[PDB]
Amino acid sequence: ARNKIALIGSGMIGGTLAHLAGLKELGDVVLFDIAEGTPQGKGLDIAESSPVDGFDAKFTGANDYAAIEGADVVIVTAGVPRKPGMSRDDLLGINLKVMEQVGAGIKKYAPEAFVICITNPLDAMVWALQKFSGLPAHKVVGMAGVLDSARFRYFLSEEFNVSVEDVTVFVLGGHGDSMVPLARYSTVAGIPLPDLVKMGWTSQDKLDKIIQRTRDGGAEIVGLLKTGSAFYAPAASAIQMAESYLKDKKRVLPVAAQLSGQYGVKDMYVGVPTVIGANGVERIIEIDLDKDEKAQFDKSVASVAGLCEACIGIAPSL
Template identity: 30%
Template sequence: MKAGIGQPLSLLLKACPLVDHLSLYDVVNTPGVTADLSHISSVAKIDGFLPADDGMKKAFTGADIVVIPAGIPRKPGMTRDDLFKINAGIVQGLIEGVANYCPDAYVLVISNPVNSTVPIAAEVLTKAGKFNPKKLFGVTTLDVVRAETFVQAITGTKDPAQTVIPVIGGHSGETIVPLFSQAKPSVDIPKEKLDDLTKRVQFGGDEVVKAKDGAGSATLSMAYAGYRFAERVMQAAKGKSGVVESTFVYLPGVDGGDAIAKETGCQYFSVPVELGPQGAVKAHNIVGSANEYEKGLLQACYDGLKGNIEKGIDFVKNPPQKSEK
């Protein structure tokens, strides 16, 4: 596991009492990380694999949940398109492994750009005849966590997580739409602070990149968010009722999703989704309840999100040509 999201996420999952067995898979470092984590006195047994000797097959076979944080950060001189092609290819390969070795697993995609990698995953699984839209989730929980945290400065509540704030749309920039008007309990945000608060949720990642001064991005907070969503999926899988989390899903494949797809013009969208033992039970349509300010944000979201989704689908249907060496 590289020193990005994967290691802190693995630590959180190893410590989670809901996890019986944790298998790590990466192209480097997995044996060392596994040995380190194996000394933790928690319930989960742990093993780790590299690509050699059918490592992916061994790691994935029998898995109930696959969490994918894989990818590389953008390096100097690398365009966003270069980065997309690399990370899209990594996700594609891992999802092919899911299709081959654990097609019934819940699949939680953290790898950016989520707006495109989730459609990539769906296309790969569909080609393999293994796509269950009720078990494919794009993890957008960091946007929710940021909204909860940043609004605390206004509300003054002791525990920010006790304020439920739906964040819908996608998982980058203007595609992220926090619906503060639907917070529970309700929050009173001064009008002059709303723009800055909204932009901070949308572009919180930039804040971390700047603070780390080129040495990284939002890895620790993303690991926490990935863990929080995985924990909720596990709770629902084990029979806990009333579990609802915002997540990026293929709307036509989830009950209640068709109405949201019709209203937004997007096949993939993050909305609050009720989770159960079989995955996504129902997508909650809260789009129409947005206030006028939020409806303006949503229009910008739709415009950006549609292009992101198409880019992911096209990556699988029309693979980029490999350059000749």
């Protein structure tokens, strides 16, 4: 029988996840949304594209959670944006409620799924989502690092004029100010960035500007598109996480995972390097940070706790 992949949210990222899941033959897809028609339409559109490329996959649009029954992977993009100066508490209120509905859906119909959360704000929403759903935490993760890592790698490849395949980056934490990059564990062909700077490939000021561009990467795309946000690279990033699970690949990926002691964090979701295989998060890799790195990490973890506490405020259920 084929793997089944449910996508909870059929907006621009949802649709892109479906298309990539077909192209890559990851299994049958269910596109779920509250909007009537959108998931049916995209699903059929993608299904109609399939003979051109030759992949055999079912695409079902649904407005009911029962459609996701037995899904091997669920990818959650359902939620609302920060439109445009609405409150920070307003946002959390709407998306926490969505995390509660989705969490009930998955618990009922797809309890054994590997769940990948994309909904913002990520570190909090994925934390709310595993509490609300009750799934084992090693089976519920947030996508954030792979995306930041993709942007950073892309910018470095431009800066150095080498393949994106030969750039490696190491990032912890979440997006924006919460990102904690390690330049010293980032490389071209294994040559660490500091050594590349020593050799003149680029300057420290330029590397810093590239790191900042990475922090602001989501907002840059918003600024160019105006009416929506990034969907191609976010979709690609989550599909890479799903693929590592489906194929038991044991990729080492930066993902929002539940820490239970590591880096001195407990009962919370933080962007860390994880090995993702057929049993979800199989190992969380604990590096030995230096004093500056530790400071920035502890600052990032504290900022995420603050958000989680705001969520407990609005939804004390948690």
